[PDB]
Amino acid sequence: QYTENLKVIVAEKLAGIPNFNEDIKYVAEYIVLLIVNGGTVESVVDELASLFDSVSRDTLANVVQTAFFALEALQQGESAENIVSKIRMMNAQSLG
């Protein structure tokens, strides 16, 4: 199962959204549940937009798309640690 790993990956992605004052672990769990229960990028984005009005739609879509891409990489055998490392790099915008 990939659910526990995906939750950690989504929480890392959420940590990179500036001034996103929310309980990251619960938002990550919510996103992962919506996906597991058959959600699409659009249905998940729409549910998030109603909850978090301050964040732009493109930022939310970016988080959800990352979740779907990460699920696929996990199914393709990529380790969660490697995925997290790439997200940290994107969040920091630095090779270092």
Binding site: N21, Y26, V27, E29, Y30, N37, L51
Partner: peptide
């Protein structure tokens, strides 16, 4: 913000029940 967190918790619980209903089938 207390209200928003209660809402998110309620929504998570709803999704957990949906997942359970799917597994039972």
């Amino acid at each position: 913000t207390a209200s928003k967190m209660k809402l998110l918790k309620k929504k998570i619980e709803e999704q957990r029940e949906i997942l359970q209903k799917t597994h039972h089938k």
